[PDB]
Amino acid sequence: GYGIALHKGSRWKRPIDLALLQFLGDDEIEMLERLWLSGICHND
Amino acid sequence: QADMIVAPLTINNERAQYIEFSKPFKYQGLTILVKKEDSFMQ
Amino acid sequence: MAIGSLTINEERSEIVDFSVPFVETGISVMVARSNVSPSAFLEPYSPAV
């Protein structure tokens, strides 16, 4: 999967993980992909 | 009484502070499983 | 920070610390579209009747 690169000593890794794991939870990330990657003419 | 958990353990925000996880083996999701279900003169 | 379409690997994760992945990504091949709806013996109720 994708991800965010850091400084190897940034110590911002922890504040991002909990924040990111929330958006994967209920309705945040599962809504953005509809706004951007929602094309048509799929398989049949 | 333990040091590792080699079992299906979902990654969750709530339980990401007491213990730390690793990179997943495989990616998955949540689905729903349900059951499924005189040919003449009717 | 380096935000964008970066992908987790082994060499990169050795020297930098990645976050929790949020978009799946692998390796795929793309091809064009091929040019019947069959029924072998038309099988009314299989070879039973």
PDB file of C-alpha atoms in Angstrom:
ATOM      1  CA  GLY A   1       0.000   0.000   0.000  1.00  0.00           C
ATOM      2  CA  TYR A   2       0.775   3.695  -0.117  1.00  0.00           C
ATOM      3  CA  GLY A   3       2.078   5.764   2.775  1.00  0.00           C
ATOM      4  CA  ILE A   4       3.806   8.909   3.985  1.00  0.00           C
ATOM      5  CA  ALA A   5       7.587   9.119   4.224  1.00  0.00           C
ATOM      6  CA  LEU A   6       9.121  10.662   7.337  1.00  0.00           C
ATOM      7  CA  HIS A   7      12.479  11.757   8.746  1.00  0.00           C
ATOM      8  CA  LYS A   8      13.412   8.422  10.433  1.00  0.00           C
ATOM      9  CA  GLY A   9      13.624  10.560  13.575  1.00  0.00           C
ATOM     10  CA  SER A  10      10.698  12.909  13.041  1.00  0.00           C
ATOM     11  CA  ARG A  11       8.704  11.486  15.991  1.00  0.00           C
ATOM     12  CA  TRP A  12       5.591  12.609  14.088  1.00  0.00           C
ATOM     13  CA  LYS A  13       4.907   8.961  13.202  1.00  0.00           C
ATOM     14  CA  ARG A  14       2.664   8.317  16.209  1.00  0.00           C
ATOM     15  CA  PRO A  15       0.459  11.462  15.895  1.00  0.00           C
ATOM     16  CA  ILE A  16      -0.219  10.550  12.250  1.00  0.00           C
ATOM     17  CA  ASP A  17      -1.071   6.863  12.755  1.00  0.00           C
ATOM     18  CA  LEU A  18      -3.930   7.432  15.205  1.00  0.00           C
ATOM     19  CA  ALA A  19      -5.238  10.306  13.081  1.00  0.00           C
ATOM     20  CA  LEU A  20      -5.037   8.219   9.899  1.00  0.00           C
ATOM     21  CA  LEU A  21      -6.561   5.111  11.492  1.00  0.00           C
ATOM     22  CA  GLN A  22      -9.622   7.199  12.374  1.00  0.00           C
ATOM     23  CA  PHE A  23     -10.265   8.232   8.763  1.00  0.00           C
ATOM     24  CA  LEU A  24     -10.196   4.564   7.747  1.00  0.00           C
ATOM     25  CA  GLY A  25     -12.840   3.871  10.396  1.00  0.00           C
ATOM     26  CA  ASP A  26     -16.418   4.767   9.476  1.00  0.00           C
ATOM     27  CA  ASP A  27     -17.144   7.449   6.866  1.00  0.00           C
ATOM     28  CA  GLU A  28     -14.166   9.729   6.079  1.00  0.00           C
ATOM     29  CA  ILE A  29     -11.817   7.845   3.726  1.00  0.00           C
ATOM     30  CA  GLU A  30     -14.732   5.782   2.383  1.00  0.00           C
ATOM     31  CA  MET A  31     -16.202   9.082   1.108  1.00  0.00           C
ATOM     32  CA  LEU A  32     -13.226  10.857  -0.505  1.00  0.00           C
ATOM     33  CA  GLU A  33     -12.649   8.119  -3.088  1.00  0.00           C
ATOM     34  CA  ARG A  34     -16.193   8.694  -4.362  1.00  0.00           C
ATOM     35  CA  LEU A  35     -15.320  12.340  -5.049  1.00  0.00           C
ATOM     36  CA  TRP A  36     -12.153  11.617  -7.053  1.00  0.00           C
ATOM     37  CA  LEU A  37     -11.918   7.963  -8.180  1.00  0.00           C
ATOM     38  CA  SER A  38     -15.481   7.135  -9.237  1.00  0.00           C
ATOM     39  CA  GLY A  39     -15.208   6.709 -13.005  1.00  0.00           C
ATOM     40  CA  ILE A  40     -17.663   4.948 -15.291  1.00  0.00           C
ATOM     41  CA  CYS A  41     -17.515   2.422 -18.178  1.00  0.00           C
ATOM     42  CA  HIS A  42     -16.578  -0.487 -15.908  1.00  0.00           C
ATOM     43  CA  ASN A  43     -16.530  -4.181 -16.821  1.00  0.00           C
ATOM     44  CA  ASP A  44     -19.606  -6.116 -17.924  1.00  0.00           C
TER      45      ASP A  44
ATOM     46  CA  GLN B   1       2.112 -14.283  29.473  1.00  0.00           C
ATOM     47  CA  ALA B   2       2.675 -13.652  25.749  1.00  0.00           C
ATOM     48  CA  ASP B   3       4.944 -11.702  23.419  1.00  0.00           C
ATOM     49  CA  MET B   4       3.360 -12.004  19.946  1.00  0.00           C
ATOM     50  CA  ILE B   5      -0.080 -12.583  18.436  1.00  0.00           C
ATOM     51  CA  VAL B   6       0.114 -14.689  15.263  1.00  0.00           C
ATOM     52  CA  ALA B   7      -3.596 -14.750  14.427  1.00  0.00           C
ATOM     53  CA  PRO B   8      -6.159 -12.721  12.446  1.00  0.00           C
ATOM     54  CA  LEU B   9      -6.074  -9.395  14.309  1.00  0.00           C
ATOM     55  CA  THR B  10      -7.740  -6.387  12.699  1.00  0.00           C
ATOM     56  CA  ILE B  11      -5.897  -3.066  12.843  1.00  0.00           C
ATOM     57  CA  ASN B  12      -7.952  -0.587  14.872  1.00  0.00           C
ATOM     58  CA  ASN B  13      -7.402   2.967  16.081  1.00  0.00           C
ATOM     59  CA  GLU B  14      -8.769   2.208  19.554  1.00  0.00           C
ATOM     60  CA  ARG B  15      -6.254  -0.595  20.203  1.00  0.00           C
ATOM     61  CA  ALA B  16      -3.310   1.086  18.446  1.00  0.00           C
ATOM     62  CA  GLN B  17      -2.050   2.927  21.556  1.00  0.00           C
ATOM     63  CA  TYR B  18      -1.727   0.159  24.156  1.00  0.00           C
ATOM     64  CA  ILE B  19       0.027  -2.179  21.694  1.00  0.00           C
ATOM     65  CA  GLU B  20       1.759  -1.600  18.364  1.00  0.00           C
ATOM     66  CA  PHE B  21       1.009  -3.502  15.163  1.00  0.00           C
ATOM     67  CA  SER B  22       3.057  -4.457  12.091  1.00  0.00           C
ATOM     68  CA  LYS B  23       2.610  -4.291   8.336  1.00  0.00           C
ATOM     69  CA  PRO B  24      -0.351  -6.495   7.355  1.00  0.00           C
ATOM     70  CA  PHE B  25      -0.057  -9.868   5.678  1.00  0.00           C
ATOM     71  CA  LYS B  26      -3.095  -9.361   3.438  1.00  0.00           C
ATOM     72  CA  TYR B  27      -5.761  -6.708   2.951  1.00  0.00           C
ATOM     73  CA  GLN B  28      -9.444  -7.498   3.392  1.00  0.00           C
ATOM     74  CA  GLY B  29     -12.797  -6.041   4.373  1.00  0.00           C
ATOM     75  CA  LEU B  30     -16.201  -6.704   5.903  1.00  0.00           C
ATOM     76  CA  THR B  31     -19.005  -8.414   3.972  1.00  0.00           C
ATOM     77  CA  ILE B  32     -22.337 -10.139   4.636  1.00  0.00           C
ATOM     78  CA  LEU B  33     -23.135 -13.821   4.063  1.00  0.00           C
ATOM     79  CA  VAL B  34     -26.732 -14.987   3.579  1.00  0.00           C
ATOM     80  CA  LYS B  35     -28.464 -18.167   2.472  1.00  0.00           C
ATOM     81  CA  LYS B  36     -29.764 -18.805  -1.044  1.00  0.00           C
ATOM     82  CA  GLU B  37     -32.947 -20.371  -2.388  1.00  0.00           C
ATOM     83  CA  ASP B  38     -43.780 -29.215 -10.274  1.00  0.00           C
ATOM     84  CA  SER B  39     -42.188 -27.137 -13.035  1.00  0.00           C
ATOM     85  CA  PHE B  40     -45.334 -27.288 -15.200  1.00  0.00           C
ATOM     86  CA  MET B  41     -49.115 -26.791 -15.022  1.00  0.00           C
ATOM     87  CA  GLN B  42     -48.688 -23.926 -12.521  1.00  0.00           C
TER      88      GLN B  42
ATOM     89  CA  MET C   1       7.320  14.839   5.260  1.00  0.00           C
ATOM     90  CA  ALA C   2       6.883  13.490   1.724  1.00  0.00           C
ATOM     91  CA  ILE C   3       3.199  13.212   0.827  1.00  0.00           C
ATOM     92  CA  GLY C   4       2.018  11.971  -2.547  1.00  0.00           C
ATOM     93  CA  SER C   5       1.692   8.687  -4.416  1.00  0.00           C
ATOM     94  CA  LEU C   6       4.554   7.003  -2.570  1.00  0.00           C
ATOM     95  CA  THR C   7       4.588   3.216  -2.232  1.00  0.00           C
ATOM     96  CA  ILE C   8       5.951   1.163   0.656  1.00  0.00           C
ATOM     97  CA  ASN C   9       8.974  -1.009  -0.125  1.00  0.00           C
ATOM     98  CA  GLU C  10      11.832  -2.683   1.759  1.00  0.00           C
ATOM     99  CA  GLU C  11      14.786  -0.431   0.887  1.00  0.00           C
ATOM    100  CA  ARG C  12      12.770   2.729   1.546  1.00  0.00           C
ATOM    101  CA  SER C  13      11.336   1.473   4.845  1.00  0.00           C
ATOM    102  CA  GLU C  14      14.896   0.685   5.962  1.00  0.00           C
ATOM    103  CA  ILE C  15      16.058   4.321   5.944  1.00  0.00           C
ATOM    104  CA  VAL C  16      12.736   6.157   6.471  1.00  0.00           C
ATOM    105  CA  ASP C  17       9.676   5.455   8.615  1.00  0.00           C
ATOM    106  CA  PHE C  18       6.415   5.070   6.708  1.00  0.00           C
ATOM    107  CA  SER C  19       2.932   5.592   8.113  1.00  0.00           C
ATOM    108  CA  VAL C  20      -0.056   3.228   8.072  1.00  0.00           C
ATOM    109  CA  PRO C  21      -1.077   2.449   4.464  1.00  0.00           C
ATOM    110  CA  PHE C  22      -4.400   3.885   3.328  1.00  0.00           C
ATOM    111  CA  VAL C  23      -4.630   2.953  -0.389  1.00  0.00           C
ATOM    112  CA  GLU C  24      -4.012  -0.506  -1.842  1.00  0.00           C
ATOM    113  CA  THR C  25      -1.489  -0.845  -4.664  1.00  0.00           C
ATOM    114  CA  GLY C  26       0.281  -3.699  -6.437  1.00  0.00           C
ATOM    115  CA  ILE C  27       1.272  -4.693  -9.976  1.00  0.00           C
ATOM    116  CA  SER C  28      -1.175  -5.033 -12.865  1.00  0.00           C
ATOM    117  CA  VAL C  29      -1.276  -5.390 -16.649  1.00  0.00           C
ATOM    118  CA  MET C  30      -3.732  -3.660 -18.985  1.00  0.00           C
ATOM    119  CA  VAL C  31      -4.992  -4.907 -22.358  1.00  0.00           C
ATOM    120  CA  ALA C  32      -7.620  -3.908 -24.908  1.00  0.00           C
ATOM    121  CA  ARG C  33     -11.186  -5.235 -25.196  1.00  0.00           C
ATOM    122  CA  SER C  34     -11.922  -8.481 -27.020  1.00  0.00           C
ATOM    123  CA  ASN C  35     -14.282  -8.588 -30.001  1.00  0.00           C
ATOM    124  CA  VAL C  36     -22.090 -15.581 -27.595  1.00  0.00           C
ATOM    125  CA  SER C  37     -24.312 -16.605 -24.664  1.00  0.00           C
ATOM    126  CA  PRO C  38     -24.119 -20.374 -25.252  1.00  0.00           C
ATOM    127  CA  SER C  39     -26.288 -23.396 -24.440  1.00  0.00           C
ATOM    128  CA  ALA C  40     -24.887 -26.889 -25.068  1.00  0.00           C
ATOM    129  CA  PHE C  41     -27.864 -28.896 -26.474  1.00  0.00           C
ATOM    130  CA  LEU C  42     -29.886 -25.924 -25.081  1.00  0.00           C
ATOM    131  CA  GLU C  43     -30.161 -28.062 -21.885  1.00  0.00           C
ATOM    132  CA  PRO C  44     -33.869 -27.674 -20.974  1.00  0.00           C
ATOM    133  CA  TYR C  45     -33.393 -29.191 -17.511  1.00  0.00           C
ATOM    134  CA  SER C  46     -30.026 -30.933 -18.111  1.00  0.00           C
ATOM    135  CA  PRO C  47     -30.018 -34.543 -19.430  1.00  0.00           C
ATOM    136  CA  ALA C  48     -32.818 -35.447 -17.003  1.00  0.00           C
ATOM    137  CA  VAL C  49     -35.997 -34.970 -19.049  1.00  0.00           C
TER     138      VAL C  49
END
